[PDB]
Amino acid sequence: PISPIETVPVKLKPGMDGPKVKQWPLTEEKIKALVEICTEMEKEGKISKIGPENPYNTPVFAIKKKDSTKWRKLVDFRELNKRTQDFWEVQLGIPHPAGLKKKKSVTVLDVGDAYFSVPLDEDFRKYTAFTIPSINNETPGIRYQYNVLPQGWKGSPAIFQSSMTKILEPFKKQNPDIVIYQYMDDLYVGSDLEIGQHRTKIEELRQHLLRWGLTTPDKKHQKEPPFLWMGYELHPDKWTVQPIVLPEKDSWTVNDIQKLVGKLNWASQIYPGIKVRQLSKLLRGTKALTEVIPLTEEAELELAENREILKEPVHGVYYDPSKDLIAEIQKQGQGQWTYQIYQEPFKNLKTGKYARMRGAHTNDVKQLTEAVQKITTESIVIWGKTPKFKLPIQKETWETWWTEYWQATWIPEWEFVNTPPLVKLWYQ
Amino acid sequence: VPISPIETVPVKLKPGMDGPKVKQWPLTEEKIKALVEICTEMEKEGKISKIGPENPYNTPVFAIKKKDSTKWRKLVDFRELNKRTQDFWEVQLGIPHPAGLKKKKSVTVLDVGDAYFSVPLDEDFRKYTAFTIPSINNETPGIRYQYNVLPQGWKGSPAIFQSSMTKILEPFAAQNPDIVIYQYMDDLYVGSDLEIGQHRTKIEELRQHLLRWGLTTPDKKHQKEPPFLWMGYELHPDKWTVQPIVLPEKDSWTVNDIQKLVGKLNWASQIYPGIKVRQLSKLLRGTKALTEVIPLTEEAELELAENREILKEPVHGVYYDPSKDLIAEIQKQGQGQWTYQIYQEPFKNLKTGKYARMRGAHTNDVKQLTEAVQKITTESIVIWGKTPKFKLPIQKETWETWWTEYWQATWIPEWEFVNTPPLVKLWYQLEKEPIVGAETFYVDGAANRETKLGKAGYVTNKGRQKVVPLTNTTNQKTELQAIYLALQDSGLEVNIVTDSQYALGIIQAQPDKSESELVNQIIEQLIKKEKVYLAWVPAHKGIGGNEQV
Ligand SMILES: N#C/C=C/c1cc(Cl)cc(Oc2ccc(OCCN3CCOCC3)cc2OCCn2ccc(=O)[nH]c2=O)c1
């Protein structure tokens, strides 16, 4: 590579010390892969071994590429990100295209390798320290720090931003209707073109970037994939807040009207315009659960009125940029998961449900992992930043298995919940 | 004169700080004259150097007689400098577990003499280690020194020493890749499959290398021979175990002594199977003064008895063999306590251990089994770098049913069923749809937050009604009460309807055990029933609810 004018100096918030974070234990296999990878990177100049006088540490994991059988090293930069990018979303911050969510199709391209051509400010290198762990604490781990702009660090695309803008300029000129947004190591490219046109334009951008020096190992299965969905493509024009659905039934029992009145009453703390009065009077005196209650004219006059009041969006619900995004996920069974993305309680910026193959293929952790990735990508496309998850999983279980199914180059913040009893029936 | 031409590790003081300025006048002639004998012999060896009143900094100096009172020792309190020095990478946290070591034909322990003092200190930093021996009462220009090497007790000594030793070993470990060297604090643990002759000569080559770098190694033979008492263990050539555990016999037990006891029992549990800490640690629940006298309970003394009986005859752990499968096996002890053994072989264990659920007011057998599996998976990943095949006392369809109907996402590696009782089953299942031809109980309960009296009751579709008074209770407790009442007074199939998300929450969790007797009785009733459908409605929205005060 080359060494452009100086190196962009990186400072921190005054009184902010570098990251010191424990390295999770890894399988022998993953340690091996990390050792190989870093031996290589050491040879190429990207990282160098360090002394005991470097206290800082950032975690490192091993995932596999996207679909590939070759190992990939994923550095978890969340801490260093909070400790730098917070003033580097300010100083060097990249502006977000609110028109990206409008496009009919959006392809994500991996541009990470670019950062590796560029050196990192000397004085800053000590904060990129990571440790390859040893099995059973038999040796002190292997300790490297970065000599070049690291993937996963939010300062990396911010520093490379100008180079990216320049390289992208010609393509942007010939294609004024294509939206291009850089989030960390990925380029999000939107268009209203038909799928064939879209894919061809994306290949045009791939070749453009390629002849300007940017490799994009997003390259597909080429001539003959045996069976796959080859294109990684989103479709944000269809992405909104999923409306609440009341059960559609011919005849109703006491129990059914109870679930109905309960769910409606729950909705009332979101939509204030709901009245359950006429459904309450149609039970009254103590009855059997299985007893069938006939639906009166007034009761259904209340029901049909509460149905179309639930198809409209809420009032006063807007995105607060000074606030963190929060994503809650609830498990629905049968390979289905439902989610909400909000900021303050009961005001939902976006909700959704993402299912997959139901049985004899995938397990719970795989599903939750793909779900978190999907939601995160939607969040990037829509707001230009990732939500903090409340995950329905035991902490240690997730901390053990999340890196098996993780194909993304970024890591969202998460925390773990034991709480919700009733949201299952209500959010499905 | 054991100095060394080892590259020094560059050190800074914490940003915006300076060198310790603490002055020491005191005190006594006896010690003062004794310090010069040490200082001149250290200066000879080049470990320290005199300095001029150029206005450097200063650090306190003490002196003390070693045990048995034969040879003296010098002390320096570096606390100030230590607080003022930069942070270093953490030396080591955990230590390797013997179950994770692999059998080697020969093993040798080498302790390094003079240690830190054999390793030089960064030049520009030496001026902050400056200290002063005073005169006797006379104010005369008492000697001023400073360290050229790693000062004892200084913040940077252990880490810098470790990295120095590593760099020194590197050219030797290259020439001898088939031998394994572990590095721990001041010692080195070497091992090889080399025949005892060439091993015995290799160790000597190592000693010569080390001494060429200024580091002493034990002269007489290789010194220490198995055991090998290391960090509370006993490492034998074919086996490992814990160092002998002694459980004291006393008339009175202070919370401190119960702390020591639970400690020893826990430590023992990694190898001796069956160890139970539940009742003894339950004594320790209340967190208060450590000098308090705590009376033991009956279950605690029974537990302790069972532990004493387990500890009677010694047991041994084996070492790891990468070629052979790693298996872990779990048994329920029944008190909310689980126990497990990890082995590649039937009659010999790599190690053992226990899991006990601490948090939560109510739990589940399958959930606890899962949590245990999680603990062991983590542990195995730590120690052996992989995850074990599991042998579990749970039917496939039981497990499948649980994880499919469980709100949280759980996952298990591949496992096989073991028919060894007690097995793990679901002691009951709530109906997912209301029961036809079953009496419907509308339950409610309420209490007064001041008097704490309250009452619990039901009203049924068959016109049946009951209200029972309660004393010393709470609204949640009155609700669980109400449900219990409906369970007692109904048939084998019953539809209950409640106004409380709390009670519904406890019950839908399907617990088979709890720390409140009420929930336990409810559990018993739930097991006794053929079908129970529990359903919820908004409280005080006037549908089927009880208007009873
Ligand atoms: N004071 C005191 C401390 C003493 C002490 C402390 C540690 Cl932590 C380790 C140690 O010995 C070993 C050293 C290296 C080794 O290297 C193993 C590395 N592998 C690499 C792959 O091949 C197999 C070996 C295996 C060892 O044990 C193997 C098992 N063993 C233990 C004790 C004994 O007497 N004989 C044995 O055979 C000794």
Residue numbers in the entry:
A (entry chain B): 1 to 428
B (entry chain A): 0 to 548
Share the article's original sentences.
Reverse transcriptase (RT) from the human immunodeficiency virus continues to be an attractive drug target for antiretroviral therapy. The drugs that target HIV-1 RT are divided into two classes: nucleoside reverse transcriptase inhibitors (NRTIs) and non-nucleoside reverse transcriptase inhibitors (NNRTIs). The compounds co-crystallized bind the NNIBP causing RT to adopt an “open” conformation commonly observed for RT NNRTI complexes.
In order to improve aqueous solubility, ether-linked morpholine groups were added to DATA and catechol diether systems. The addition of an ethoxy morpholine to catechol diether compound 1 significantly reduced potency for RT (WT). Crystal structures for RT (WT) in complex with both 1 and 2 and were determined and analyzed to explain the difference in potency. Additional π-π stacking interactions were observed between Y188 and W229 with compound 1 along with several van der Waals contacts. The crystal structures could not provide an explanation for why compound 1 has reduced affinity for RT (WT). In order to explore this more, we conducted MD for RT (WT) crystal structures in complex with compound 1 and compound 2. Compound 2 maintains stronger contacts with K101 and E138 (observed in >100% of snapshots due to multiple bonds with K101), whereas compound 1 only maintains one strong hydrogen bond with K103.
